[PDB]
């Protein structure tokens, strides 16, 4: 279907404890495939998914350089941002950047992204336009002017429209057997008695990929949304994910409740009940 | 495949 490539970057200053820790990771969809950590013994951009491993040494040398460059750009930007905000060199601060592209099943750009955050807060963002900037504050406005002057959006837009899309396509092809295979959740319902009056019904979804999934409880086949507890989808640690959904229901009424599971890997949505 | 250009300082 639709697919995405994302690069995430985090620089954390640690004054009095060396220079900024820089960590960047590359995702295709929900699959980590590259990483770089400025704290690794001899830092290289390293593969983290098999299909990327075919890429040649020129690829790895270049990606390593770009990450190093990003690390350095970030060190400078943390310095600069202290001046923009009149902050002390004594405080630890975070620069975050994400960028990448969405492609439709047709493989053409659906949406491109490039966004920065300073200390957990939006700083500057490429608009959906892929052609204009939105600065969150006065400091970021300074950055905006610098970047408008350099015609950054123009070149970023070409990247999001060209390489990003094209390499995403090629990754998708090289990782066909995995990136393009949807693994359905193994599902089951557990029953957890609270008291003589109530029980928890917990609908489980395990070993699925991609992370996107819908778990819902119905009662007599009618919506039970604002009455449902959904935990955050979580990684199993092997590239698949887990989630559960839970309702507290009157004891002896369990049979009115059906769990419903929608997921790319299911030909048709599931209806599950607790095995009473 | 990562993006990079010169002059991206904030």
């Amino acid at each position, epitope marked *: 279907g639709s697919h995405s490539m994302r690069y995430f970057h985090t620089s954390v200053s640690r004054p009095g404890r060396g220079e900024p820790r820089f960590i960047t990771v590359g995702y295709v969809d929900d699959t980590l495939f590259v990483r770089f950590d400025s704290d690794a013994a001899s830092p290289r951009e390293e593969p983290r998914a098999p299909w990327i491993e075919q890429e040649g040494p020129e690829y790895w040398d*270049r990606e390593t350089q770009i990450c190093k460059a990003k690390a350095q*750009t970030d060190r*400078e930007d943390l310095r600069t941002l202290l001046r923009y905000y009149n902050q002390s060199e004594a405080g630890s601060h975070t620069l975050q950047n994400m960028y990448g592209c969405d492609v439709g099943p047709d493989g053409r750009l659906l949406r491109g992204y490039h966004q920065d955050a300073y200390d957990g807060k939006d700083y500057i963002a490429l608009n959906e336009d892929l052609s204009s900037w939105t600065a969150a504050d006065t400091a970021a406005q300074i950055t905006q002017r610098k970047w408008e002057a350099a*015609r950054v959006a123009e070149q970023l837009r070409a990247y999001l429209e060209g390489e990003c899309v094209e390499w995403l396509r090629r990754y998708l092809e090289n990782g066909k057997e995995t990136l393009q295979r949807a693994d359905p959740p193994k599902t089951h319902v557990t029953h957890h008695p609270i008291s003589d009056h109530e029980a928890t019904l917990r609908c489980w979804a395990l070993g699925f990929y991609p992370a996107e999934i819908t778990l819902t409880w119905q009662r007599d086949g009618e919506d039970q949304t604002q009455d449902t507890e959904l935990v955050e989808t979580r990684p199993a640690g092997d590239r698949t994910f887990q989630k559960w959904a839970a309702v507290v229901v009157p004891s002896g009424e369990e049979q009115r409740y059906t769990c419903h599971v929608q997921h790319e890997g299911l030909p048709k949505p599931l209806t599950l009940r607790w095995e009473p | 495949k990562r993006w990079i250009i*010169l002059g991206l*300082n904030k």
Partner: T-cell receptor
Amino acid sequence: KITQTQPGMFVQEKEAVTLDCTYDTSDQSYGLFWYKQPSSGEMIFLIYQGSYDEQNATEGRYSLNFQKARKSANLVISASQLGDSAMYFCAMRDLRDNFNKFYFGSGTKLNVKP
Amino acid sequence: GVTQTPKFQVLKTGQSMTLQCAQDMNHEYMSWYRQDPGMGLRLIHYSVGAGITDQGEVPNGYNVSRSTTEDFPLRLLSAAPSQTSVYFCASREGLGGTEAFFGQGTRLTVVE
């Protein structure tokens, strides 16, 4: 590696002049720079071109005829003035060293004839 | 932008001297080149930020310091004839910056 083949170029005042430059880089990311060094010896930045800039740079009378394929980055100076007589350096920084060093060419002495 | 001094300098062999360089552009990156016939522009030292300096292509005979982002003084502890050259202080917004502004230059002559 920057190649300026012309140790010197001459041009009639008011005429336009193209100063040749070719650069050798394996990296897909780089910047080409021109500097002017007049008799008094300063290094005046004139113009910059990014390897990913599709437009050819322009700054006043300076234009950079950037041919990524031909690997040339010729400076064109429109309407040459006597004040243009100087040394012109083609220079480049690339990804290999994270854009650290400037690599300067031998330079070309522009002689604008009145 | 970049105020480099002095523009001219004659030095007796063995004498010290500090070439001065300040920038009022909040530049993180500063560097020193020497310009020599047939040698192009060689990097001597550079500083990607305040408190960080590193050795260029020809650091020997020179030391630098980066106490503040504004200044990048180049120091010749013991002048040698070889160090006769034209020195340029260069600054820019960052390692990957494109605003590459050179100083007026310091023309140095080391005499016996």
